[PDB]
């Protein structure tokens, strides 16, 4: 264990240790892995952008995408070298990455105002931001002579068995990792580097199961944890869950959406809602989990024809973010989600993807585990759930621009 957990400002020693590690690791790489790495060090932009949105297309599209082969080989090379002890890394990020769509300070100013610092603090306070894709990080705190692209520096601690790939490009050593978690900013402080102030954000990792395009593995997990869910429900609860799935969902959910429980109380429907809710609390979600929902425009106050629903125009995206980013949306109805991120027929035309982080022990059930409900990958969430929208991103799906909403269940 000839390595500290954090090299701090000691650049010289950080580089010396990593230079050797790089040489060591490269000898454990296959021709294909080396191939991919060479392509990366020549065009990081494309490959990185791809690694961030690859999971949202049809399974058919993913398999035939040229970049998929590159992604898989690079992904393998990374997970190849798991660190034996934790390590802290450093990297500069754009504030926009955290929904702070303003400037902390210009490149010419040296100080950061109190107002700006408080506004940033409140924006990236109690929020989990999902991170995905390849990213180059540094093992030491930037200093005199180092590149400082933005006024925001992230100091992140990576867990024991995190994959990390030290590599040599031209003459300098670099570190590649693949983000597959959520980050929480615990504290932000001002630090000065060469006369200029920078925000240093102390960040921690929050892990969650995210099957992404691997629907088969997610289905296996869902069946394993809910195979006997139906066998534990009382006759009444089973009958109501069955009715709900058999077509009763429309009446039940319409009743909830129109505030029936408080505007036109229906004893028969309230009973079913109660049994279904209790059924969802019988076997709470076993661990932190990410689910996906392709939403219709109505869920966000729009219609298929609404002019603001055309995200191909950047004006409409900005309008959407001003209204929903950082806000909380409440679903009166029970809400269906999928354990997989892949696009599917029937939802192919929807433009809004809600990517929800479900905390361990939240109510929920894998409906596709019920006898006579296969190849559906469905997770049902409780009625009245509240989701905090942390960030809005966009990507192009063919000729249509679509949105990805990074949200957290906060019920
Ligand atoms: N949308 C998804 O991502 C997934 C849907 N499914 C299943 O596939 C089937 C059909 O898909 P959907 O049309 O999504 O069915 P849905 O049963 O969830 O809802 C039908 C319609 O009501 C909506 N709606 C829901 N909450 C609303 C709210 N709070 N305010 C205004 N409008 C609201 C949707 O916009 C949708 O057009 C469903 O039976 C569902 O269980 C399965 C996995 C994922």
From TrEMBL:
Entry coiled-coil feature ranges: 8-42
- Residues recorded as binding NAD(+) 3, renumbered to this chain, are 293, 296, 298-299, 333, 350
**What are the record keywords, sorted?**
Coiled coil, Nucleotide-binding
The entry marks the following residues as binding NAD(+) 1, namely: 293-294, 298-299, 333, 350, 376
- CDD domains assigned: VIP2
Q: This protein's superkingdom?
A: Bacteria
Gene Ontology molecular-function annotations: nucleotide binding
Q: Name one GO cellular component term.
A: extracellular region
InterPro entries hit by this protein: ADP-ribosyltransferase, Binary_toxinA_clost-typ
Q: Which residues bind NAD(+) 2?
A: 293-294, 299, 333, 350, 378
The ADP ribosyltransferase domain covers which part of the protein? 16-205, 220-409
The name this protein goes by in its record? Iota toxin component Ia
Q: What is the lineage of its organism?
A: Bacteria, Bacillati, Bacillota, Clostridia, Eubacteriales
């Amino acid at each position: 264990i000839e390595r500290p957990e954090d090299f701090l400002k000691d650049k010289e020693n950080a580089i010396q240790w990593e230079k050797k590690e790089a040489e060591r690791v490269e000898k454990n790489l296959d021709t294909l892995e080396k191939e991919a790495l060479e392509l990366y060090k020549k065009d990081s932009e494309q490959i990185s952008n791809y690694s961030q949105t690859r999971q949202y297309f049809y399974d058919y599209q993913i398999e035939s995408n040229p970049r998929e082969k590159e992604y898989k080989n690079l992904r393998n090379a990374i997970s190849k070298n798991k660190i034996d002890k934790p390590i802290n890394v450093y990297y500069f990020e754009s504030p926009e990455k955290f929904a702070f769509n303003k400037e902390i300070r210009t490149e010419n100013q040296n100080e950061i105002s109190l107002e700006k610092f408080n506004e940033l603090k409140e924006t990236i306070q109690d929020k989990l931001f999902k991170q995905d894709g390849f990213k180059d990080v540094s093992l030491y705190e930037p200093g005199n002579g180092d590149e400082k692209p933005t006024p925001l520096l992230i100091h992140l601690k990576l867990p024991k068995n995190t994959g990390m790939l030290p590599y040599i490009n031209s003459n300098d050593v670099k570190t590649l990792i693949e983000q597959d978690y959520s980050i929480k900013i615990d504290k932000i402080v001002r630090i000065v580097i060469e006369g200029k102030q920078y925000i240093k954000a102390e960040a921690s990792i929050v892990n969650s199961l995210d099957f992404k395009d691997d629907v088969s593995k997610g289905d296996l997990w869902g069946k394993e944890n809910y195979s006997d869910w139906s066998n534990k429900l009382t006759p009444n609860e089973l009958a109501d869950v069955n009715d709900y799935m058999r077509g009763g969902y429309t009446a039940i959910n319409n009743y909830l959406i129109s505030n029936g429980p408080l505007n036109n109380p229906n004893p028969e429907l309230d009973s079913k809602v109660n049994n279904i809710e209790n059924a969802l609390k019988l076997t709470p979600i076993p661990s932190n989990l990410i689910v996906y929902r392709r939403s219709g425009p109505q869920e966000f106050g729009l219609t298929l024809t609404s002019p603001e629903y055309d995200f191909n125009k950047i004006e409409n995206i900005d309008a959407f973010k001003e209204k929903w980013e950082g806000k909380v949306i409440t679903y009166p109805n029970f809400i269906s989600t999928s354990i997989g991120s892949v696009n599917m027929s029937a939802f192919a035309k929807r433009k809004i993807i809600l990517r929800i982080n479900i905390p361990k022990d939240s109510p929920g059930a894998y409906l596709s585990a019920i006898p006579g409900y296969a190849g559906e990958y469905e997770v049902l969430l409780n009625h009245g759930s509240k989701f905090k929208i942390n960030k809005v991103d966009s990507y192009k799906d063919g000729t249509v621009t679509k949105l990805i909403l990074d949200a957290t269940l906060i019920n």
